[PDB]
Amino acid sequence: IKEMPQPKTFGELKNLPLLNTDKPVQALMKIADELGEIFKFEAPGRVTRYLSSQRLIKEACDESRFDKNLSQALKFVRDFAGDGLKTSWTHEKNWKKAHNILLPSFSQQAMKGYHAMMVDIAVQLVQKWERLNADEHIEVPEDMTRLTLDTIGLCGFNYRFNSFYRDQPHPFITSMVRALDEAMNKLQRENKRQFQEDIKVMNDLVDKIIADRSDDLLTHMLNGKDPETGEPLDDENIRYQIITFLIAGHETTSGLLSFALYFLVKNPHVLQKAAEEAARVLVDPVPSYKQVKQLKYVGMVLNEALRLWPTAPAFSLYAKEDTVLGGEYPLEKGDELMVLIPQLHRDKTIWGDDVEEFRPERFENPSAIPQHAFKPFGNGQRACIGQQFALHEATLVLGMMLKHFDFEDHTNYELDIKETLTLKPEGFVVKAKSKKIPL
Amino acid sequence: IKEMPQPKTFGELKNLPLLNTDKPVQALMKIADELGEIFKFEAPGRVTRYLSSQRLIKEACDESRFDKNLSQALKFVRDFAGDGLKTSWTHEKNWKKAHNILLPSFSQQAMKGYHAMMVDIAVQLVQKWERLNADEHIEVPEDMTRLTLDTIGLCGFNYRFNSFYRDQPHPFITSMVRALDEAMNKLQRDENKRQFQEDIKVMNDLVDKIIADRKASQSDDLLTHMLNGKDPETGEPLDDENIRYQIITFLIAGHETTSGLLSFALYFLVKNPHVLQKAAEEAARVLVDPVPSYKQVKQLKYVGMVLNEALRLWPTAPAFSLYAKEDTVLGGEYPLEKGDELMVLIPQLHRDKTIWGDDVEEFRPERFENPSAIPQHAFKPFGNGQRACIGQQFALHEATLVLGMMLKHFDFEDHTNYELDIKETLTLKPEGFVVKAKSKKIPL
Numbered sequence: 079i080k081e082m083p084q085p086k087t088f089g090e091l092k093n094l095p096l097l098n099t100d101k102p103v104q105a106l107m108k109i110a111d112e113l114g115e116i117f118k119f120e121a122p123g124r125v126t127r128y129l130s131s132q133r134l135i136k137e138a139c140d141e142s143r144f145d146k147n148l149s150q151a152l153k154f155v156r157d158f159a160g161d162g163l164k165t166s167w168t169h170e171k172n173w174k175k176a177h178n179i180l181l182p183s184f185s186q187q188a189m190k191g192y193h194a195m196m197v198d199i200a201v202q203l204v205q206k207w208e209r210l211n212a213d214e215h216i217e218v219p220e221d222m223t224r225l226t227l228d229t230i231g232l233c234g235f236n237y238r239f240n241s242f243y244r245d246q247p248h249p250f251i252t253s254m255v256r257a258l259d260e261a262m263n264k265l266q267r268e269n270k271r272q273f274q275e276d277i278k279v280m281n282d283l284v285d286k287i288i289a290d291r292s293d294d295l296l297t298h299m300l301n302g303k304d305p306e307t308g309e310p311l312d313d314e315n316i317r318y319q320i321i322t323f324l325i326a327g328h329e330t331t332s333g334l335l336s337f338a339l340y341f342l343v344k345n346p347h348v349l350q351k352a353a354e355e356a357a358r359v360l361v362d363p364v365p366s367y368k369q370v371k372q373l374k375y376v377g378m379v380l381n382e383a384l385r386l387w388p389t390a391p392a393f394s395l396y397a398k399e400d401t402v403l404g405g406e407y408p409l410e411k412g413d414e415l416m417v418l419i420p421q422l423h424r425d426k427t428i429w430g431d432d433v434e435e436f437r438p439e440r441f442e443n444p445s446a447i448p449q450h451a452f453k454p455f456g457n458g459q460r461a462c463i464g465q466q467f468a469l470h471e472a473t474l475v476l477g478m479m480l481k482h483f484d485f486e487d488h489t490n491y492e493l494d495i496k497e498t499l500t501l502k503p504e505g506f507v508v509k510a511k512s513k514k515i516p517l
Numbered sequence: 518i519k520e521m522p523q524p525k526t527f528g529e530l531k532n533l534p535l536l537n538t539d540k541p542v543q544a545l546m547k548i549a550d551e552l553g554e555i556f557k558f559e560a561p562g563r564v565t566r567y568l569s570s571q572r573l574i575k576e577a578c579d580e581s582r583f584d585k586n587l588s589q590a591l592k593f594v595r596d597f598a599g600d601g602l603k604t605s606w607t608h609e610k611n612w613k614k615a616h617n618i619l620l621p622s623f624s625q626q627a628m629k630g631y632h633a634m635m636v637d638i639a640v641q642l643v644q645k646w647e648r649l650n651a652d653e654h655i656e657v658p659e660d661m662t663r664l665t666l667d668t669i670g671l672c673g674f675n676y677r678f679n680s681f682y683r684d685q686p687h688p689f690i691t692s693m694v695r696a697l698d699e700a701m702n703k704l705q706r707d708e709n710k711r712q713f714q715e716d717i718k719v720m721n722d723l724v725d726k727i728i729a730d731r732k733a734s735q736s737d738d739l740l741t742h743m744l745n746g747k748d749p750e751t752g753e754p755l756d757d758e759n760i761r762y763q764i765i766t767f768l769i770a771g772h773e774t775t776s777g778l779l780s781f782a783l784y785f786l787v788k789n790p791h792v793l794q795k796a797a798e799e800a801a802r803v804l805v806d807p808v809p810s811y812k813q814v815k816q817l818k819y820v821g822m823v824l825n826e827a828l829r830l831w832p833t834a835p836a837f838s839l840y841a842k843e844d845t846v847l848g849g850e851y852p853l854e855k856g857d858e859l860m861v862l863i864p865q866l867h868r869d870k871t872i873w874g875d876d877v878e879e880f881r882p883e884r885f886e887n888p889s890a891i892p893q894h895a896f897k898p899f900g901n902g903q904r905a906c907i908g909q910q911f912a913l914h915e916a917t918l919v920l921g922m923m924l925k926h927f928d929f930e931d932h933t934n935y936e937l938d939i940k941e942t943l944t945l946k947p948e949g950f951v952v953k954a955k956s957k958k959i960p961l
């Protein structure tokens with residue numbers, strides 16, 4: 079019925095040069111602003127469709143009609159993440175098998191065992207900031223990445239990256255980041271030689287984490303059995319899961335903490351409510367698990383930060399069979415879709431006309447949010463298995479940050495969103511004035 | 518660990534005779550004025566604590582520490598509302614099941630289907646007022662009740678009470694009101710019991726009549742979801758017994774608190790002409806068509822602030838009850854044992870000077886310009902958490918639409934210089950509130 083719009087083309091390259099830019103997600107958002115809820119995007123050897131409305135995305139989230147597709151970004155991540163959970167197809171045997179084995183270690187109930195090690199790294203962050211000299215500022219995304227990397231290293235694998243003891247990030251991050259950089263750079267197109275060297279460095283630490291082998295993920299991956307097949311994970315897939323969780327378990331989370339702190343200092347009314355809750359609830363020197371679940375408004379702050387800037391800003395789907403999207407866009411079996419999460423979260427027909435404003439009170443009552451309107455952690459059985467982990471860590475850390483310091487946007491920072499495969503506010507810096515509450 | 522104060526006692530009756538008064542909520546507010554943010558209240562076989570400060574109520578709204586309790590009022594309403602949504606305990610299977618089944622029919626998105634029938638009744642209200650003769654006046658709470666009862670009857674169940682064709686209420690209303698009256702009368706204190714059962718039968722008769730007529734005529738309404746909706750957890754639909762209780766619940770819950778809100782809002786507007794002017798200007802600017810649209814109603818921002826400010830000063834469901842899930846300490850100085858009850862005195866909470874400033878009694882809708890500037894749990898006219906009012910958006914959409922049309926089509930005069938007199942049932946209303954409306958002669 080309806081003919082789909084399409085952005086400007088570049089001859090034989092079609093739409094591909096539109097992604098030859100350092101902020102491709104923000105470029106795709108602007109195109110969505112111009113073209114609406116759906117537009118076709120073409121590249122040599124590829125056709126996909128970018129969805130932006132809750133009306134169409136709720137249909138795309140029907141798992142009986144659409145399954146997770148590996149985007150080109152995920153295909154490049156697969157080169158070192160293998161058939162780990164995030165880069166495996168749903169129909170590959172190792173997805174469901176690893177899913178069954180690892181889901182128990184990610185329950186809201188499983189966070190109780192991780193909590194103490196999360197506090198360990200969180201205290202290290204607070205002490206660094208307590209120990210700054212007068213007029214010394216904080217590099218927010220840099221320190222958040224220190225925290226989330228160390229948290230997943232310790233909580234997941236009882237490995238200490240000791241990022242707060244370094245200026246130059248761990249030998250694993252640079253290789254991982256340069257691999258991730260080559261993955262994203264390849265989308266926008268001796269790099270091949272460096273790509274393999276970085277992959278070896280990652281496989282090097284992974285076999286080092288494994289070699290000597292607690293209350294962590296590595297235990298379940300070495301001892302857990304899939305109740306379906308009765309099998310445990312084989313050694314090859316275990317390595318891929320370790321690589322997967324080290325990546326997936328840190329960078330989207332540090333972005334979330336970075337954006338949350340940005341929005342707080344840009345909205346002092348909100349920071350006051352959040353800081354009062356942290357002070358009222360976190361009455362002990364070390365926060366407990368139960369106290370963290372009580373940080374309701376802090377959780378609302380985090381969800382609203384995820385609304386405006388979801389740090390994993392898209393996911394891909396393919397049609398399981400011939401079907402019609404929205405009653406006017408017919409699709410053939412295998413046709414691909416892209417869900418543009420930042421645009422979905424700005425659907426005025428869902429959230430009202432003031433979508434760009436940071437208002438955590440949108441999330442005061444979760445039942446008021448329509449289905450599939452809010453998708454920062456993906457969809458269905460392929461949703462983010464680490465969702466509860468990420469939110470408990472971020473709630474704990476932001477709560478501790480708000481309890482122990484007042485924050486100043488001393489440079490009046492202008493939001494600049496650096497894009498890798500994830501989003502971060504580049505150059506975000508603050509000053510912290512300690513409230514002198516002991517640990 | 519502070520010992521909480523307690524109002525005057527009457528021997529073995531303890532505090533109970535203090536409720537033997539025709540304005541008990543306003544009586545309890547005065548006691549709060551004298552005793553402060555918390556006072557114990559005792560009756561034979563009952564002990565509860567009335568909270569009045571945002572400081573303590575924000576803790577009471579922690580759902581991990583406190584759950585909804587059935588007040589004695591709700592226990593008496595349960596005698597004919599059963600395990601419907603409002604009178605069921607959270608741990609009863611039928612609460613979560615009905616909650617899951619009925620939320621889709623109450624989304625901010627679900628109002629789009631209700632909007633046309635809301636306009637149907639709202640136009641009937643405007644036309645009644647257009648048709649008054651000179652020097653005739655309007656009985657505000659009576660007409661607002663005509664409006665809200667007909668709206669929930671039509672929107673909810675495709676049943677027309679036709680209240681604007683009657684001086685005497687529909688037989689269900691008279692029984693329902695007298696049942697609600699007996700429920701409240703039982704609190705402050707026979708053959709009332711014989712009449713109580715007759716009124717319950719009249720209510721069940723209309724309910725069983727609406728079910729019959731629907732089964733002999735698929736609509737877009739509440740009754741449809743109650744007959745066809747499935748709980749996504751269990752896959753079960755509601756059984757017939759609970760369906761009847763939900764109908765009774767929504768007919769009660771869906772009208773009387775809403776008519777109070779409209780009545781109080783119009784009172785505060787005519788007592789504050791600068792506010793009425795701002796609200797009327799927004800109505801004229803936004804409602805540019807003869808029939809208001811759904812989208813235009815969401816654009817009545819100031820009217821919505823007017824409604825929230827009326828709900829601040831006189832929340833028409835003036836209290837709700839909670840019990841401690843486990844042993845806990847309230848405010849760092851009031852220890853509570855598992856099962857201890859609390860009462861949240863909403864009108865007093867909304868007059869907390871530490872939250873709203875020294876001008877708490879003044880009607881200033883601009884207080885609600887920014888929700889982020891309002892401390893947590895300072896404003897609770899629709900309850901708390903998962904047991905909050907499921908009809909909140911329904912109520913606010915209806916009142917915004919109707920108040921918008923009222924301000925568009927008429928100028929209003931407080932011709933008697935009305936003295937606010939708040940009648941108390943289980944809800945609050947401004948008794949005897951009357952105005953004159955001078956039509957602006959804008960066609961529909």
Ligand code: HEM
Pocket residue numbers: 146152163164165177230322323326327328330331334388389390392393394453454455456457459460461462463464465467468
């Ligand atoms: C704020 C933090 C996070 C965000 C916004 C986020 C976002 C997402 C999204 C959108 C997906 C779906 C990807 C797709 O459909 O292609 C996903 C999947 C996944 N995430 Fe996260 N994530 C976060 C934190 C974490 C953490 C902390 C972990 C590990 C502890 C993790 C591990 C995973 C895994 C393993 C998958 C693949 C699940 C599967 O397909 O079976 N994530 N994440």
Ligand code: HEM
Pocket residue numbers: 585602603604616669766767770771772774775778832833834836837838897898899900901903904905906907908909911912
């Ligand atoms: C201005 C109008 C209204 C006010 C002030 C109001 C107030 C409240 C309050 C305070 C509660 C919580 C009671 C408690 O905790 O014991 C509640 C619950 C409830 N209300 Fe309303 N309400 C209004 C309109 C409506 C409407 C229009 C409907 C139906 C369409 C409705 C249906 C309900 C139901 C079913 C519950 C029980 C929800 C549950 O516990 O699952 N209310 N209301």
Ligand SMILES: O=C(CCCCCn1ccnc1)N[C@@H](Cc1ccccc1)C(=O)O
Pocket residue numbers: 097119120121124126149150151152265390391392393416499500
């Ligand atoms: O939009 C994106 C960004 C998605 C990255 C999300 C990765 N993530 C998810 C969870 N943690 C990381 N990617 C498209 C771009 C493209 C379109 C057409 C042709 C070539 C490339 C793609 O990769 O296919």
Ligand SMILES: O=C(CCCCCn1ccnc1)N[C@@H](Cc1ccccc1)C(=O)O
Pocket residue numbers: 536558559560563565588589590591704774834835836837860943944
């Ligand atoms: O204060 C109240 C007010 C009732 C709230 C209105 C109920 N509602 C909610 C939504 N629509 C109606 N009720 C107490 C009074 C009392 C205290 C101690 C002993 C006896 C009676 C109670 O019922 O327990």
